Design an enzyme around this catalytic site. Sequence first.
Site, PDB file in Angstrom:
ATOM      1  N   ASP A  13     -34.183 -27.558  -2.820  1.00  0.00           N
ATOM      2  CA  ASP A  13     -34.697 -26.246  -2.294  1.00  0.00           C
ATOM      3  C   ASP A  13     -35.706 -25.715  -3.390  1.00  0.00           C
ATOM      4  OD1 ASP A  13     -33.731 -23.821  -0.744  1.00  0.00           O
ATOM      5  OD2 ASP A  13     -34.001 -22.994  -2.758  1.00  0.00           O
ATOM      6  N   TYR A  66     -41.319 -19.460  -6.621  1.00  0.00           N
ATOM      7  CA  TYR A  66     -40.588 -19.862  -7.953  1.00  0.00           C
ATOM      8  C   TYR A  66     -41.553 -20.377  -8.790  1.00  0.00           C
ATOM      9  CZ  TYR A  66     -36.434 -19.692  -5.044  1.00  0.00           C
ATOM     10  OH  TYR A  66     -35.322 -19.194  -4.110  1.00  0.00           O
ATOM     11  N   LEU A 117     -25.445 -31.090   0.267  1.00  0.00           N
ATOM     12  CA  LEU A 117     -25.528 -30.687  -1.283  1.00  0.00           C
ATOM     13  C   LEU A 117     -27.139 -31.018  -1.877  1.00  0.00           C
ATOM     14  CD1 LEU A 117     -24.395 -29.926  -4.055  1.00  0.00           C
ATOM     15  CD2 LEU A 117     -24.014 -32.340  -4.455  1.00  0.00           C
ATOM     16  N   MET A 124     -28.894 -32.571   7.627  1.00  0.00           N
ATOM     17  CA  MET A 124     -29.321 -32.036   6.482  1.00  0.00           C
ATOM     18  C   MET A 124     -28.200 -32.364   5.374  1.00  0.00           C
ATOM     19  SD  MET A 124     -30.013 -27.919   5.889  1.00  0.00           S
ATOM     20  CE  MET A 124     -30.201 -27.132   4.438  1.00  0.00           C
ATOM     21  N   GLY A 136     -31.503 -31.249  16.082  1.00  0.00           N
ATOM     22  CA  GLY A 136     -31.267 -32.471  15.957  1.00  0.00           C
ATOM     23  C   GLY A 136     -31.419 -33.369  14.766  1.00  0.00           C
ATOM     24  N   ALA A 137     -31.960 -32.786  13.868  1.00  0.00           N
ATOM     25  CA  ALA A 137     -32.117 -33.418  12.326  1.00  0.00           C
ATOM     26  C   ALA A 137     -30.608 -33.194  11.349  1.00  0.00           C
ATOM     27  CB  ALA A 137     -32.999 -32.881  11.599  1.00  0.00           C
ATOM     28  N   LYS A 150     -39.943 -22.103   1.338  1.00  0.00           N
ATOM     29  CA  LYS A 150     -39.967 -20.664   1.905  1.00  0.00           C
ATOM     30  C   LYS A 150     -41.224 -19.959   1.591  1.00  0.00           C
ATOM     31  CE  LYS A 150     -35.347 -20.718  -0.333  1.00  0.00           C
ATOM     32  NZ  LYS A 150     -35.728 -21.199  -1.615  1.00  0.00           N
ATOM     33  N   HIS A 165     -38.313 -16.271   3.576  1.00  0.00           N
ATOM     34  CA  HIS A 165     -37.530 -16.113   2.355  1.00  0.00           C
ATOM     35  C   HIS A 165     -36.720 -14.802   2.321  1.00  0.00           C
ATOM     36  CE1 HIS A 165     -37.838 -16.977  -2.075  1.00  0.00           C
ATOM     37  NE2 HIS A 165     -36.579 -16.586  -2.144  1.00  0.00           N
TER      38      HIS A 165
HETATM   39  N1  LIG Z   1     -33.004 -17.840  -0.651  1.00  0.00           N
HETATM   40  C1  LIG Z   1     -33.133 -16.915  -1.666  1.00  0.00           C
HETATM   41  O1  LIG Z   1     -33.317 -15.679  -1.609  1.00  0.00           O
HETATM   42  C2  LIG Z   1     -32.587 -17.609  -3.132  1.00  0.00           C
HETATM   43  C3  LIG Z   1     -32.534 -19.012  -3.281  1.00  0.00           C
HETATM   44  N2  LIG Z   1     -31.807 -19.732  -4.467  1.00  0.00           N
HETATM   45  C4  LIG Z   1     -31.625 -20.947  -4.304  1.00  0.00           C
HETATM   46  O2  LIG Z   1     -30.523 -21.325  -4.979  1.00  0.00           O
HETATM   47  C5  LIG Z   1     -30.385 -21.880  -6.013  1.00  0.00           C
HETATM   48  C6  LIG Z   1     -29.147 -21.785  -6.836  1.00  0.00           C
HETATM   49  O3  LIG Z   1     -29.013 -20.362  -7.285  1.00  0.00           O
HETATM   50  P1  LIG Z   1     -29.403 -20.076  -8.579  1.00  0.00           P
HETATM   51  O4  LIG Z   1     -29.435 -18.402  -8.613  1.00  0.00           O
HETATM   52  O5  LIG Z   1     -30.423 -20.667  -9.306  1.00  0.00           O
HETATM   53  O6  LIG Z   1     -27.964 -20.088  -9.560  1.00  0.00           O
HETATM   54  P2  LIG Z   1     -26.574 -21.062  -9.475  1.00  0.00           P
HETATM   55  O7  LIG Z   1     -25.409 -20.338  -9.123  1.00  0.00           O
HETATM   56  O8  LIG Z   1     -27.234 -22.371  -8.868  1.00  0.00           O
HETATM   57  O9  LIG Z   1     -26.511 -21.147 -11.011  1.00  0.00           O
HETATM   58  C7  LIG Z   1     -27.481 -21.766 -11.874  1.00  0.00           C
HETATM   59  C8  LIG Z   1     -27.077 -21.562 -13.430  1.00  0.00           C
HETATM   60  O10 LIG Z   1     -25.818 -22.427 -13.616  1.00  0.00           O
HETATM   61  C9  LIG Z   1     -25.999 -23.277 -14.842  1.00  0.00           C
HETATM   62  N3  LIG Z   1     -25.041 -24.490 -14.282  1.00  0.00           N
HETATM   63  C10 LIG Z   1     -25.507 -25.398 -13.402  1.00  0.00           C
HETATM   64  N4  LIG Z   1     -24.483 -26.493 -13.344  1.00  0.00           N
HETATM   65  C11 LIG Z   1     -23.566 -26.025 -14.430  1.00  0.00           C
HETATM   66  C12 LIG Z   1     -22.503 -26.870 -14.595  1.00  0.00           C
HETATM   67  N5  LIG Z   1     -21.907 -27.867 -14.144  1.00  0.00           N
HETATM   68  N6  LIG Z   1     -21.797 -26.139 -15.753  1.00  0.00           N
HETATM   69  C13 LIG Z   1     -22.176 -25.003 -16.414  1.00  0.00           C
HETATM   70  N7  LIG Z   1     -23.375 -24.246 -15.970  1.00  0.00           N
HETATM   71  C14 LIG Z   1     -23.855 -24.962 -14.889  1.00  0.00           C
HETATM   72  C15 LIG Z   1     -27.420 -23.535 -14.611  1.00  0.00           C
HETATM   73  O11 LIG Z   1     -27.585 -23.971 -16.222  1.00  0.00           O
HETATM   74  P3  LIG Z   1     -28.815 -25.371 -16.596  1.00  0.00           P
HETATM   75  O12 LIG Z   1     -29.837 -25.046 -15.373  1.00  0.00           O
HETATM   76  O13 LIG Z   1     -29.342 -24.841 -17.862  1.00  0.00           O
HETATM   77  O14 LIG Z   1     -28.112 -26.467 -16.510  1.00  0.00           O
HETATM   78  C16 LIG Z   1     -28.087 -22.394 -14.491  1.00  0.00           C
HETATM   79  O15 LIG Z   1     -28.043 -21.409 -15.533  1.00  0.00           O
HETATM   80  C17 LIG Z   1     -31.808 -21.325  -6.649  1.00  0.00           C
HETATM   81  O16 LIG Z   1     -32.230 -22.198  -7.960  1.00  0.00           O
HETATM   82  C18 LIG Z   1     -32.632 -21.454  -5.650  1.00  0.00           C
HETATM   83  O17 LIG Z   1     -32.958 -22.892  -5.212  1.00  0.00           O
HETATM   84  C19 LIG Z   1     -31.403 -18.538  -5.351  1.00  0.00           C
HETATM   85  C20 LIG Z   1     -31.394 -17.136  -5.172  1.00  0.00           C
HETATM   86  C21 LIG Z   1     -32.234 -16.653  -4.244  1.00  0.00           C
HETATM   87  O1  LIG Z   2     -35.679 -14.245  -4.234  1.00  0.00           O
HETATM   88  C1  LIG Z   2     -35.190 -15.386  -4.686  1.00  0.00           C
HETATM   89  O2  LIG Z   2     -35.147 -16.392  -4.112  1.00  0.00           O
HETATM   90  C2  LIG Z   2     -34.794 -15.461  -6.219  1.00  0.00           C
HETATM   91  O3  LIG Z   2     -35.094 -14.101  -6.826  1.00  0.00           O
HETATM   92  C3  LIG Z   2     -36.484 -14.287  -7.059  1.00  0.00           C
HETATM   93  C4  LIG Z   2     -37.279 -15.275  -7.357  1.00  0.00           C
HETATM   94  C5  LIG Z   2     -38.665 -15.129  -7.954  1.00  0.00           C
HETATM   95  F1  LIG Z   2     -39.289 -16.079  -8.120  1.00  0.00           F
HETATM   96  C6  LIG Z   2     -38.958 -13.952  -8.009  1.00  0.00           C
HETATM   97  C7  LIG Z   2     -38.447 -12.770  -7.655  1.00  0.00           C
HETATM   98  C8  LIG Z   2     -36.753 -12.795  -7.129  1.00  0.00           C
HETATM   99  C9  LIG Z   2     -36.207 -11.482  -6.719  1.00  0.00           C
HETATM  100  S1  LIG Z   2     -36.527 -10.288  -7.847  1.00  0.00           S
HETATM  101  N1  LIG Z   2     -35.619 -11.847  -5.667  1.00  0.00           N
HETATM  102  C10 LIG Z   2     -34.711 -10.708  -5.178  1.00  0.00           C
HETATM  103  C11 LIG Z   2     -35.404  -9.884  -3.970  1.00  0.00           C
HETATM  104  C12 LIG Z   2     -36.861 -10.512  -3.654  1.00  0.00           C
HETATM  105  C13 LIG Z   2     -37.385  -9.861  -2.410  1.00  0.00           C
HETATM  106  C14 LIG Z   2     -36.418  -8.771  -1.804  1.00  0.00           C
HETATM  107 BR1  LIG Z   2     -36.995  -7.996  -0.189  1.00  0.00          BR
HETATM  108  C15 LIG Z   2     -35.344  -8.464  -2.043  1.00  0.00           C
HETATM  109  C16 LIG Z   2     -34.791  -8.956  -3.149  1.00  0.00           C
HETATM  110  F2  LIG Z   2     -33.191  -8.776  -3.689  1.00  0.00           F
END
Ligand SMILES: NC(=O)C1=CN([C@@H]2O[C@H](COP(=O)(O)OP(=O)(O)OC[C@H]3O[C@@H](n4cnc5c(N)ncnc54)[C@H](OP(=O)(O)O)[C@@H]3O)[C@@H](O)[C@H]2O)C=CC1
Ligand SMILES: O=C(O)COc1cc(F)ccc1C(=S)NCc1ccc(Br)cc1F
Length: 316
Positions: free
Chosen positions: A44, A49, A16, A13, A10-11, A78, A111
């Site tokens: 996020d 991290y 972006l 989000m 019900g919340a 997470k 996570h």
């Molecule tokens: N649940 C999970 O397992 C995971 C969750 N995530 C979440 O998703 C988020 C986003 O994914 P992430 O992997 O960080 O990467 P993104 O796909 O969001 O890319 C981030 C990169 O893009 C650059 N960038 C951002 N905006 C622009 C722009 N307008 N033009 C050019 N370059 C740009 C940033 O540079 P700069 O910062 O130098 O500006 C950084 O190097 C993570 O930070 C995390 O919060 C990600 C991976 C796994």
């Molecule tokens: O995970 C994130 O959010 C972004 O990535 C990370 C962010 C961190 F701060 C530390 C490690 C990761 C890695 S290496 N993540 C990949 C990963 C981790 C665990 C398992 Br199960 C599989 C896998 F694919």
Amino acid sequence: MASRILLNNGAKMPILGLGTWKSPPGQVTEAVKVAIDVGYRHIDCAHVYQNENEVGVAIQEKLREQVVKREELFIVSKLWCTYHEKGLVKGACQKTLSDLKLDYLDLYLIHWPTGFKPGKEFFPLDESGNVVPSDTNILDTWAAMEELVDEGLVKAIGISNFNHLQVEMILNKPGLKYKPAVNQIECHPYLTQEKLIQYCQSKGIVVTAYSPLGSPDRPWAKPEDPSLLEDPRIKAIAAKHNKTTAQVLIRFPMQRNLVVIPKSVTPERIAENFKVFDFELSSQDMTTLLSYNRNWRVCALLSCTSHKDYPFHEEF
Ligand SMILES: NC(=O)C1=CN([C@@H]2O[C@H](COP(=O)(O)OP(=O)(O)OC[C@H]3O[C@@H](n4cnc5c(N)ncnc54)[C@H](OP(=O)(O)O)[C@@H]3O)[C@@H](O)[C@H]2O)C=CC1
Ligand SMILES: O=C(O)COc1cc(F)ccc1C(=S)NCc1ccc(Br)cc1F
């Protein structure tokens, strides 16, 4: 476009949010402050991290400053893999709450679906480099998550990186009390995830797209890997709309009814990435972007691939 999506708890989000993986601790406080000033209302975060204290400093300043009210913010964190056991989940959540300067989270995610041996190391390894699992099952970890709702620490719970069969496991859990509100998965034009997204959306789950720009700062990037931001086909769509390639890449998941969480620590880009509510991609453009799928992943990890619950051996 509508700025928030209704969850099954019900919340509402915000569609972006600001990502924080790899945001240096020395820069992420300013990044989050700037984000909140320019309109972001979803952050996020994750324990793994290593920057939650600095994210929390920013949030607290903006709340103290009366820039935004707590009820207007949507803060996600997470549960890391080394805390899947029953008796560790509450303390893990409480540590994150303490770091973020909050008394509840809007959303708390598992996570990854893989539990690891508890301890100080985020990736406990055996002598040959394989991650050491825990004999926690996912369903038991979900029950521990449900307790957090009932104790008032978190308003909603969800999952991240769960495949089709793992989502179904959770949905079919005996005695399920709370359905997952969100599944956070990697999604962008080169990994379009159509199958998994249709499954989750058919079940009422909201999908969050991570790495929407292809995570060009990932630590394991190799100079020759595909690059979304430099793809001249995406540049051409951007030019037609007088927008940047990043803006197209952020708008794309929004028009698929996804939440999206681009990361930046650059104030100008934090601003740029929020200006995605004043243009629409056509259906033709959307279909074209979908056509770029190559099943390529940012997030995968060889040391974890034999874990029984590793998610990406499955088709989706
Ligand atoms: N649940 C999970 O397992 C995971 C969750 N995530 C979440 O998703 C988020 C986003 O994914 P992430 O992997 O960080 O990467 P993104 O796909 O969001 O890319 C981030 C990169 O893009 C650059 N960038 C951002 N905006 C622009 C722009 N307008 N033009 C050019 N370059 C740009 C940033 O540079 P700069 O910062 O130098 O500006 C950084 O190097 C993570 O930070 C995390 O919060 C990600 C991976 C796994
Ligand atoms: O995970 C994130 O959010 C972004 O990535 C990370 C962010 C961190 F701060 C530390 C490690 C990761 C890695 S290496 N993540 C990949 C990963 C981790 C665990 C398992 Br199960 C599989 C896998 F694919």
